[PDB]
């Protein structure tokens, strides 16, 4: 297919989104990812090469992609994500910080021949258009809400002994799954301590806390997305887009652009400008795969 992409800072004082698109034409294989970093860019930077390499490795070990073992593909991509996060946390600890507290979300799409898989953590979103109809392919990992993932995430966080205030875990983080974010994982106890030292809560408060598991995890949801000849285009984007434009609206908008000039790169740039005209307040990154059709 053809790719259109854009990644802009918009109204934020820093740019922490990034995008990756890598193809192997001989193998009919492509990897597209949007990363939405927070509290710095070091996690995003790490993921840029490390996640690709690990995913490619996890799936090549066994020529795994089109074997039809969904379970095995799913397990491979999960272990890839978990492994990368393990390595990131070490890196953040040794090649850092000392005040680097960064993290990043990630929505990855892998296509090989006529199969597509999505590995997703966080609050970017992927959608496609199929015979004129929208399919929303991912669900949000937020510690509040009503979608399938939402109730389960809040349950998982509370189960780990964390709490949620102002729609944030420990009043801090607004996503429940992410790479990095060591203070919610292997340094959560230290986190409580720092809070006392910085006067965000009392000593007796920390006493009543009992962390059982990690509050934030990098374990992805994994989806298999059937590809058919009537899939018109696929869109991966950060929440800088979706928070300000409903997916049914973006799909109609892109369809209109492509009917107009058939240029996916121009469609993508014009879409990002619509998001800015609507005064989205975040970095905005968009990747569109134009598969053509009718």
């Amino acid at each position: 297919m053809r790719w259109g992409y854009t990644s802009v800072q918009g109204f934020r004082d820093e740019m922490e989104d990034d995008i990756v698109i890598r193809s192997d034409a001989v193998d009919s294989f492509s990897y597209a990812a949007v990363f939405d970093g927070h509290a710095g860019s070091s996690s995003v930077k790490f993921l840029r090469e490390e996640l690709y390499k690990e995913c490619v490795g996890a799936l090549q070990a066994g020529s795994l992609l089109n074997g039809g073992d969904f379970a095995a593909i799913k397990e491979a991509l999960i272990k890839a994500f978990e492994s990368v996060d393990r390595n990131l946390l070490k890196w953040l600890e040794a090649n850092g910080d000392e005040e680097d507290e960064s993290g990043s979300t990630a929505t990855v799409m892998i296509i090989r021949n006529d199969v597509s898989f999505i590995a997703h953590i966080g609050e970017s979103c992927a959608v496609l258009s199929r015979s004129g109809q929208i399919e929303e392919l991912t669900d949000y990992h937020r510690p509040y809400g009503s979608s399938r993932a939402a109730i389960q995430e809040v349950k998982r966080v509370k189960e780990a002994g964390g709490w949620i205030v102002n729609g944030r875990i420990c009043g801090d983080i607004a996503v429940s799954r992410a790479f990095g974010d060591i203070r919610f994982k292997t340094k959560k106890n230290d986190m409580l301590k720092k809070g006392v030292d910085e006067g965000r809560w009392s000593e007796k408060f920390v006493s009543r806390i009992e962390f059982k598991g990690d509050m934030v995890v990098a374990t992805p949801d994994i989806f298999q997305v059937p590809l058919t000849s009537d899939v018109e285009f696929i869109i991966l984007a950060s929440d800088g887009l979706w928070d300000y434009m409903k997916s049914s609206d973006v799909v109609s908008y892109v369809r209109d652009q492509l009917r107009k000039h058939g240029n996916v790169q121009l469609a993508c740039e014009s879409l990002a400008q619509v998001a800015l005209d609507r005064r989205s307040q975040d970095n905005i990154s968009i990747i569109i795969a134009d598969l053509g059709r009718t």
Binding site: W163, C170, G171, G195, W201
Partner: peptide, 10 residues
């Protein structure tokens, strides 16, 4: 919204 914030108890 800013994705992180200084933490707060319930």
């Amino acid at each position: 919204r800013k994705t992180v914030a200084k933490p707060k108890g319930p």
